[model samples]
Target chain A: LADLFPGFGSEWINTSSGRIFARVGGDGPPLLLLHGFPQTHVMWHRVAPKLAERFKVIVADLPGYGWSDMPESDEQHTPYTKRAMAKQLIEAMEQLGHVHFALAGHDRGARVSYRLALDSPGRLSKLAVLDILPTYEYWQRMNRAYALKIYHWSFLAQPAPLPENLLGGDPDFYVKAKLASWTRAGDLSAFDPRAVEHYRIAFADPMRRHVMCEDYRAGAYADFEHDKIDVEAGNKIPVPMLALWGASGTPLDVWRKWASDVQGAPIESGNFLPEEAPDQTAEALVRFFS
Target chain B: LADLFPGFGSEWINTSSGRIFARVGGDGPPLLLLHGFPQTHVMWHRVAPKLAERFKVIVADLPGYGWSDMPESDEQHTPYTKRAMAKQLIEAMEQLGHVHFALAGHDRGARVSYRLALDSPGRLSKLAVLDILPTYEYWQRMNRAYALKIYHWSFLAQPAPLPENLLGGDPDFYVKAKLASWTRAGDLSAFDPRAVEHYRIAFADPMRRHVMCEDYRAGAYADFEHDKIDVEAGNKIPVPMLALWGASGIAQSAATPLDVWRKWASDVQGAPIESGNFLPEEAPDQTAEALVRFFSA
Candidate 1:
């Protein structure tokens, strides 16, 4: 893992939100990179070291995802809500004295970056989200295929213990199978064997089960309600957003709805970005963030 | 189930097509009633007795459903296709005395009834479908809401044991949850406790799981494809059909059943009767009344 980021220094950053585990490395303008679900910040390992040459890369795990502190969920699961997650992450970045930064998120991470760019405008210099539908529209555009593809969103959200218990059979099996399902060619051939093991490490303990489910739990129920509050008020991300998708992904027409000056193109792989097409992923970011 | 239909007699009749288990009762012109998924001939227990008072009623299980023997499925899942299920049931009706009869079906059974009447119009006097839209029209106007409400259609339609293994851990729990979830207020209170036990008793075995999944596999694959062929060919059921749905079911105002079904039937009469999905038991009187009125002549 250290070899993935040759010159990076890794440590825990303590904050009011919670303790965040991250690897901060490289030089130029600070670039804050976040990872998605059932995964740690390592999703960027394939792309980060290259981006590090020209930018200060901060690759960190979302709350409760890595060996990080898990925030306690409130009544509406507000603590786990994406906006709250964005705010908490901002605290960690600001503590490093690099308050202003470039943001790029993939999967669940992109959802947070979307909220950050919308709700915490001044914190970001530019934004890029990979392989994601604007979270709210996911509900509006749902169909049998959508439900079948994202059943986990509903299954994990079904009042705790139920999902936690069901997935308890073998979190490692579920995570591994899911990784292969979303990756290109529907297998882990593109993924580093180490990264797959890292995922297994993060999920090996059964305690991580609720934290993972709660993340989606918050996504489906609490985040949905909170998103309406901001969306109805018509809050939009003013900065240019470069939406990157797989060769076979949701169209760029969807991005035009959220961010103007939106430039998007397919990255030539499936959902496991950075790993599946690190060259395309980094090139897209390097071109846009420049 | 028998107590619900006090005067009905239960028996199995073998046909060249397949063996069909039916509860035969009633007194006038023959009425054939077919049950839907996660249910059996028992679904008509409440409606059968009332319809039996006026028209002779035959409530039977579809192949691979209830106590019936499971059929062997081929590459096309022909054994469980609505066309094949309808043909076998029609054969069973002939074997039992009535060569031509009035037909009514609910849910999956409705799909069979629709096709049977379209292909075998000469053998039917009247046709009625409950709480369903045409199979092909579902694809034409599918949206997120429709998917969320009927996710089971796709889930059950997956290749094979992917779904079977998932639900195998707790088939009864999953079955009851589906029954309650699809019901009004989204719970099982609307269902009779005894009726639920009847579902639990049958769904307890793993055989029912594979059979049920294949039935849906055929629906999503073959049934869906056939529905399209018929739609394009402008195939219409020559037999007069009455399409009845629940007031608060999948089809309503703008998504009217009559609008979709009228194109597929020569003569049509459809409306939201009184209840929801399980119309026969949930609103038996309205169900039987509609049947009596439609099949009386």
Candidate 2:
């Protein structure tokens, strides 16, 4: 994982969720990148380097995912809520001497990115979310087709040991299926073998698997409620937002409602935009950020 | 497992799906009883004898459930569809020389019961569906609460081996959990240990587990479409329909269960037993009384 980052400096920063794992490198303006579910900062390995050339990129694993701490969850799953995760990530960024930064996140990370912008708009100069609609929109638009496509959201959110025990049965099969199915090619050809290993490693541990379920539990419960509150209150992302999605991602029409100034387009990829189409992903980020 | 149904004789009869397992007993009007998911005909043990005193009882496992041959499944899972299972069971009943019979089914079996009535209304003298709406209505009414209550509908329907392999890890745990959770008591108190053993016996087999997944796959895909087709074509059950559900079941909370059935069923009427998903095991007396009265009427 370290070798993939080349000159990137690995660090563990203290936050409310616990100590977070991040790979910091590059030069120029600060750019903090957050990763999605079943993956770590390594998802950004391909695109981060290109973005790093023009901006100091900080790629960190979200709480309860990858190398970050799997803190004990509460009834509300407050520890894993995007609100808690965003605050902790901001704390990590501040500890690194950058209070505000350009933020881009993918999948579950995109969920956190939008939440960060909503909760603390000034902390992010620009926000880019890849291959996702706001959690609220997704839930509201859940028809049979959408539900079938994203069954995991409800499956993982099922009460406790059911999902944890099931996932623990075959972590490799689950991880590979999840990652591959979301790609344009419908396989792992786009993912680095080493990064895939890192993902498999996290899922192999029962603790990590429980945390992964808790993260989704929060998504279905607290995170969803938070987004619903914002929607009802007419709260939108106060910052200029770039919603970049893959070919198989959510429509930009919905994103427009959540943000005051939102611009987005589909990259020629699937959900794993950063790895599946790094060139386009990087170009999109640079174009938007610049 | 056999001791649970003291005087009943078990039989394995050949059908298109494969050899189906059934327990036959009683005498008088033929009343075929079908069991639900993760369970077998043994689910009827508590109520069958009482039902037998009033009517001839034929309790059979659905194909790919308990003690039944788990024939190979296709991409469409056609063999596991309610359409196919109902046809196979009807053939089994014909082989036993009963061309028409009163039918009572719970859960998946209720699905097969309704499909049978819809396809061959003349073949069934009467139909009693326990604790369920049609497959089409369930999917159409799916919301966050219902989705959570019935997560297994999606989980088991996921592409094979995932649910099968996961279930294989600890079959006893899965079997027991499913049985206990759906009960009014929320435990195995209503279940006889030996009967529970029968349900566990089926789930322990990898083949049976795969069939279980295929059954739900059919429910979500082929079965749902079949019901939708019937709904759009203005098809309704031509026979008298008796809908018996548990107090803690799908009947009460979501609109009136009778009303939902009335759309697909013309002459539908019944009441909720003070039980849960397992109406037979939890409240066998009420369940049997309801069935006997409905069938005899």
Candidate 3:
């Protein structure tokens, strides 16, 4: 992981829940990058160095993913909720001496990024979410196409042991299939071998596998309810929100409902936009955060 | 498997697709029994003999389920569709010298029973479907509760190899977990250890595991579209449809299974058996009596 980002400092920042693994580098305005599922902060390797030149880049793994501590979940899966993740990450950011920062998150991290923007109003100078819509839209509009595309949302959320049992049976096959399927290339072309190994290690661990399920359990129930509560109250993200998705990913129109001012376009890649189209991803981030 | 069905004649009946395994016993009007997923025809063991007093019970495994042959699936999974399975089963019944017979199906078998009524209307004298609705209705009313309860509908239908690979890893654990979860008891209390071993044998086989996934794939696509087409054309089942579900099962949840059947059938009447999804295994006497009363009418 270190070889990917030269001259970067690795830090394990502590939050109330647990310690968060992050790599801080570059030099300018504080910019935080959070990674998505099945992969860790290594997902940003392709683009982090480039972005590091323009901003103080802090790439971190969301809880229960990557090198972050796997905090135990409550019955409601409150610990893994996007709200909970956002709160802990804010604490980590504060400890890093960046009370306010620009943030970009991909996939699950994108979910955490938006939640941070929603929960802590002024903590984000700007918010960029990659390859996703609000959690509420995904659930509400789960027609056959979306349901088939995102079946894991419900499968992983199944109560305990069942999902874990099935996934644990063949973690290597399951994780590889998952990563490849989400890409427009429908292969591991976008992923670096080093990064894939890191992801494979986490997925193969029985405890980490369980934590990932808790992460999704929170997504389906608590995270879903949180989005609903805000929607009912007509509250939206106050920060300037930039949404980037693969050309084959979700449409930008869905973000309009959750944010006050939303702007984004399609990246020429798949779900892993940062890795698949790093130059384009970095260019977009530099322009937005600069 | 034969020990469960004592005094019953076991035979391998041939269909155009392949050989279908069945156990025949008793003597009266011919009655066909089809079993559901992750289990075999032995599911009807407790009730078969009792029902045999008044009806000739032919308990057969659906293709790809039990001792029946697991036919290769097309890209569309057409071979595993309820329509396809029903067609072959009707052929099997015909070979058994029962041109027109009463039929009772549990789970996937219920799906086959309904499709037989729809596709070959005059073939079934009476149709009794246990613990299920039309394939179309299941997909249409997939809210959070229904989706959670029946996650396998989508998961199994996931473009092959993935579901098969995951399940094949520990077939014993996966099948047992599935059988226990769907029961009202939330354990294997309703199942006979003998019958469960039979189910475990089939589920543990890699070929059978892939075929089961194909069964659901057919459910989601071919079966769903068949029901949709009939629905659009205002085609209803021409025979009397008797729907029975567990009192603690989907009978109360989702859409009322009986009410939904009423829309798709001309003559429909249903009541909940005091069991879970496995009505026959859970409440054998009530299941047997209901079928006799309905078919006898």
Winner by lDDT: 3
A1-290 in candidate 3: lDDT tens per residue?
33578879999999988999998998999999999888889889999998899999999988877789988888999878999999999999989899999999998899999988988979988999998888888888776656666889889999998899999788999999988988889898888888888889888999888888998898889999999999899898889989988987536677887888889999877888988889898899888888
Every candidate's lDDT = 0.79, 0.87, 0.88
Clashing residue pairs, candidate 3?
Answer: none
TM-score of chain A of each: 0.96, 0.97, 0.97
List candidate 1 stretches off by more than 4 Å. Answer: A1-17, A64-80, A136-174, A197-240, A253-257, A262-264, A286-290, B1-9, B13-18, B72-78, B232-235
Candidate rank order under lDDT: 3, 2, 1
DockQ of each candidate relative to the true complex: 0.28, 0.59, 0.66
Ranking by TM-score: 3, 2, 1
lDDT (10s digit) by residue, model 2, range A160-261: 878887776678888888898888888899899998988888778888888888888988889999999999999888798898888864477898889999
Model 2 misplaced stretches (Cα beyond 4 Å): none
Q: How many Å off is the CA of B50 in candidate 3?
A: 0.8
Candidate 2 lDDT over residue span B188-219, tens digit each: 99998888888888888888889889999999
Which TM-score does chain B of candidate 1 obtain? 0.95
Give fnat, all candidates.
0.20, 0.34, 0.45
